[PDB]
Amino acid sequence: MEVNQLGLIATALFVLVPSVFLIILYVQTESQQK
Amino acid sequence: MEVNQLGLIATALFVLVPSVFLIILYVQTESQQK
Amino acid sequence: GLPWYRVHTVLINDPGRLIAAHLMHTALVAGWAGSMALYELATFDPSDPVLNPMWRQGMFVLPFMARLGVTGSWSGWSITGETGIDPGFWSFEGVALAHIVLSGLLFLAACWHWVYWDLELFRDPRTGEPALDLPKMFGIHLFLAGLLCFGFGAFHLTGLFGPGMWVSDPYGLTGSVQPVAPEWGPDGFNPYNPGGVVAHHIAAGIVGIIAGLFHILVRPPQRLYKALRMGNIETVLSSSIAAVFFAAFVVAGTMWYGSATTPIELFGPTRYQWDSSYFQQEINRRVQASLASGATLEEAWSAIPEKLAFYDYIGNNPAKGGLFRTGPMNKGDGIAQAWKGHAVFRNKEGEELFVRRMPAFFESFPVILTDKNGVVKADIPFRRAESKYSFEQQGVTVSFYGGELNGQTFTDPPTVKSYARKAIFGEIFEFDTETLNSDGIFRTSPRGWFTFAHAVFALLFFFGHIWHGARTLFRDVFSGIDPELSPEQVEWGFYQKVGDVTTR
Amino acid sequence: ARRTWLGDILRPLNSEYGKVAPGWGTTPLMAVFMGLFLVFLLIILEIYNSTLILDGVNVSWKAL
Amino acid sequence: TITPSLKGFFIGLLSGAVVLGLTFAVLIAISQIDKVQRSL
């Protein structure tokens, strides 16, 4: 199918950038003193 | 120029994935009890 | 700790780092402007302002530079089609460079203000607590805004010391940057009168200067200070967001309806010029004037500027696009090359027939031809078995006047029908569809994209206003209501006045 | 906190946090300007909307 | 000159001022007649 050639990187960064933001924040919460 | 259509996402993920791994590790080190 | 959606509240009691964050936001925005201009210069084709102007090419910041007088490139071209021009430093490239340098300097200032956050200037001299005197800051900044507004109007727009602004004829054929004198009568409030833009900046600027001085010199009334929580910087965020969503709705409106500050040679024509056949009427007027003066039909139509014919084409209507049909208009119908000329359809009796034009609402539209009184005379049928008006039955032909096909007549029904299909879009053009691998599907112009983003952001900023106005007026209960809340204050009959314990 | 040359010059401009005029102060005058401004906005809206039509004011591209 | 629609604009302006003025005049009068009672 003749899809948009930027659709793949658009979708990839749409997932990765905010997901990574959340993972950074989660992991540094877990490493805080308990 | 007729470049490889996957060159962009290859380069982006090559940068993003290992950089994110380091950033995660660094930030959760900083947040540990000093 | 702080939830993720509150991380930036660490700035509320830290004026120095708030300034640093504002410097960084400013650096990012100026860096975007420079980057965007460079990307547009790397992709813009300046070779044809007639059939390939900036608004066919997806240019978004180029029209804003042109609106205020930046029209030339260091490489020698201008957006009105000139060669060998010298723009001086303030070419499109020089503007872009200036924004990149500004971005770097703001970045460095942000670093300084983040490190040296603890300035004595930011402390209340009595309490030693961080404190901004927002009422007086408002006066200082309003005075500055008024001076700058006034100077923009009195020096830049007038050409007294500056280039002026983009102005054009009513059909967008001969636009250029010109000095503009202020209009001091009631036509200054006509959105289509550029002199009113000049008068506005002179008059509003002076008013801003006067009101700025008032706000520097006169303290807020105690009753307004308390009611609007003028000691709380979040009240400024609330009312500033409100002013900004008002301004955003205004620029969305003037972009969609058109005004002296949204000219069609920079942003493309409006949807309403298609709705009202604005360009078709002027084309017909010129042709009829040529005929009355003794021109032949070929001469009358050959006198129509291709730029004028091109506005009378629905592929330039900004209400023909799609939300995910991305890029320049040229990616759709193609890069316009030439006017084919005006198509005149006739039936076998020789009556002139007119193709019913497509309204903007319709993604697709049938081919129906009427005589001058609107009586249907031919069409392209769907079902054939009871067809009465087919081009074959009615002997429909098409002759072209002006443009590439001037003097030519077609009688082959498939060829005549193909031209009739194009005539529902208005005037007919030849397009290069190969250079961009154009897909034949209409896209909107910068007029459409600007209007969409700013109406959307305006509506979203209404929520921001509501949210921060609430945070301001309800700061005392941000973490919850009083754990010892008097049930008599919420039950009925205890207090004469709701929520006032002094009322029994 | 850190004093600077520039900070000492600007100090009086950020020294009156919390200072108010008594009572209602200039609120009445402010209300008059607000009302005038509401009428101004209503005028320019109705001109643009063709609800208010003025001699010599042709709200169109044609005759700018 | 005063066009018909400028005259109409003035009629609408006056009408709105009358509605607001009568409304507030009535509310102010009622609020003064029927005051809340507070302990001294």
Add this chain to the structure above:
Amino acid sequence: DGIREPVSGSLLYGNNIITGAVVPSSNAIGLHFYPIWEAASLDEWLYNGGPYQLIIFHFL
């Protein structure tokens, strides 16, 4: 619709998430019960919309 006009529903046959579907079983079948073992082959079962019936009956 049982008129030998097959509708493509799957991703690999040209659909995206918005257009894709498991397509209802053939109008020629009507309300007849069409398990896998009523077809002469999986290829027949697939052409006639066998997956739809297996899925909706197990789902319900």
Add this chain to the structure above:
Amino acid sequence: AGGERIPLLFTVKNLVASTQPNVTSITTSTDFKGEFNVPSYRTANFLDPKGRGLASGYDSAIALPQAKEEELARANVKRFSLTKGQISLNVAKVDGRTGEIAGTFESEQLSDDDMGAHEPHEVKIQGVFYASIEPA
């Protein structure tokens, strides 16, 4: 304007140019008009950046060993242009004692076609000229 570079072989090679009749003396009214040859801007040995040429070089795109050749024929098969140019010389000054004349010229000719790879452009050249005439 915009950066496009136009190379040309500015030339009057094999010029033959004639005056009006009855030039019993050359004066500031004498004019010359004539035609000249414009040979290819590069001569036959010139090799393109992939080593292809006319009288030397490769005859194919050797970095694309199995590409189809018809689409590259215009780049692969070098051609040598030979066209005509025109010039007018307007005498503006004459030293009758020394046989020297000077004036302005205008010439028209085609630009470089890169050995057939693209269409040439039309060029107009204006300038000044000098000539010394002597009996022979």
Add this chain to the structure above:
Amino acid sequence: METITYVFIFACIIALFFFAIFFREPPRIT
């Protein structure tokens, strides 16, 4: 490429379901 992308996102969601159920923060009475 599009099919791979759609199935990839779907597969990540199914994996997320698994962690969200079996590796949730356990509810604790305090």
Add this chain to the structure above:
Amino acid sequence: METITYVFIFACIIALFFFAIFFREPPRIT
């Protein structure tokens, strides 16, 4: 798109230089 990519990576490297010099872990004698 290629040029953007090359310049982007380069610009990130220059930024990294800035942080690595001016926002380094300060060397400390103990």
Add this chain to the structure above:
Amino acid sequence: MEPNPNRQPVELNRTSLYLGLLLILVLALLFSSYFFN
């Protein structure tokens, strides 16, 4: 430098991680068809 007293730690608990990843992934599943177009 003297420390900034306005700094605060930041947190994202595990449930919020799961909720956020679900939002992102489902938004991606939704908009990806339109990005490919």
